[PDB]
Design a protein around this ligand. Structure first.
Ligand code: HSO
Ligand code: HSO
Ligand code: CL
Ligand code: CL
Lengths: 259, 259
């Protein structure tokens, strides 16, 4: 069953990537391609998921929870295009995110960059892979040595901005720009810390098996389990995320955030 | 002669890309690959340039001006890896920059992304191309509608920070992260404005023919010609750059910068 879930997840990603490639870089003139692409890619992923698993649920931004039954043990939580600003501006560092949750816990995550043809797959029980090769996070001696990413300086509001700044000022260097891709880099051992505020569950659940299966750590800003039980009544509110390659760095970050 | 300059520039870029690909993503463990790569790639570019053009000069960050004669009409100004933070962190949006200057004016520029296999070529007299296909900037109705990039919020010091903020607050959205790649996106019509402070000449001269040959505008923050006459005594100081797809946007930006 678990290899069947992986095979179907890969089929979904293959379909989404062809759709997305059709619309990327079409907008260089003075519904938009990104909206069509998101919708069409989601439909292509859902269609193959539900053909293979009619008892499963799906969850996406626009349509919410959908299931032919009142309830489901298995829920696919999808974002065809995480990083729509990158997509719209022609930058190939957006990703397609696919998570499969069993009783609310992610058991499979994919980060797919269809232009670069890079696919990270996290599966509970397995080491994370990139294009079929195992990857690992790296150690990092101290927060002062850590390479930090976040999408944008402007995506922190209120007290979260002050907390971010506390961590930001302590790392080796803060870098910006690319949504889920930074977490993929962390999982491959090229980034030490990612700290973001205001992620919806379809933009973080796929990250969890990827990072954890690479040896990293990902929690909310209090260090609690990042969790969202997709259900008919779950609310897609936004969460604060901190991911690290090294658990000691993670703790240092938590101590600076003071959330 | 001009097609010979283009052929040799492409040979140089082909050599640099193979060198860089050898060292990219080797640093996922707990002289570095980026330093070796930069040095080796520069040497590979210089070696083919000077074999083809022994009367020419070359200019690079580490070695400065080099020429077998006291003077040269033609000077190649190179940066093997613009975006070393991206390179070090495994992000494939650094670029190799090659500029050829005749009497101090760029006549050829290349932006090469060797992982993505994307090459923008600007040649005076020709429309800019990406992988051999002509590209163009796009129009933009007003600064309020403009997509803006800059590498980092932290790369503005002093009065330049205040000037940046004046423009930043007026655009549709400010985005971050990727060095020369944003200028390539502008030249292809996917970005409207790029505003940066503190670029060395080896990181902007190649941009000029690329952007101008796409229909865009690139100047210093006073709207003056961005120029650096590479010579035995030229100082590689840093410059402020503003590039736009549309000349009306460019003017609006200048008016906000108030430099
Ligand atoms: N990838 C996320 C959704 O586009 C970016 C983000 C960061 N913080 C809040 N939102
Ligand atoms: N690509 C440039 C050199 O890495 C980035 C930069 C922006 N402003 C100052 N420096
Ligand atoms: Cl089923
Ligand atoms: Cl010669």
């Amino acid at each position: 069953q678990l290899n069947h879930f992986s095979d179907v997840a890969n089929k979904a990603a293959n379909a989404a990537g062809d759709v997305i490639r059709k619309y990327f870089r079409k907008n260089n003139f003075d519904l938009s391609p990104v909206t069509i692409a998101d919708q069409s890619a989601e439909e292509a992923m859902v269609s193959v998921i539900l053909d293979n698993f009619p008892s499963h649920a799906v969850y996406g931004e626009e349509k919410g929870w959908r299931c032919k039954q009142d309830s489901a043990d298995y829920v696919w939580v999808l974002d065809p295009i995480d990083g729509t600003k990158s997509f719209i501006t022609g930058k190939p560092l957006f990703g397609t995110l696919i998570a499969l949750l069993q009783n609310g816990t992610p058991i499979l995550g994919i980060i797919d960059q269809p232009v670069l043809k890079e696919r990270w797959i996290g599966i509970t029980g397995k080491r994370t892979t990139l294009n079929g090769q195992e990857v690992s996070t790296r150690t990092c001696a101290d927060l002062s040595q850590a390479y930090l990413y976040t999408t944008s300086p402007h995506l922190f509001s209120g007290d979260a901005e002050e907390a971010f700044i506390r961590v930001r000022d302590k790392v080796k260097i803060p870098l910006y720009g690319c949504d889920c891709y930074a977490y993929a880099l962390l999982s491959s051992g090229f980034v030490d810390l990612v700290v973001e505020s205001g992620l919806k569950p379809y933009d973080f659940l796929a990250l969890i098996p990827v990072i954890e299966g690479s040896g990293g750590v990902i929690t909310d800003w209090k260090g609690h389990q990042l969790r969202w039980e997709a259900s008919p009544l779950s609310i897609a509110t936004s969460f604060n995320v901190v991911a690290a390659g090294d658990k000691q760095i993670h703790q240092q970050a938590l101590d600076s955030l003071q959330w």
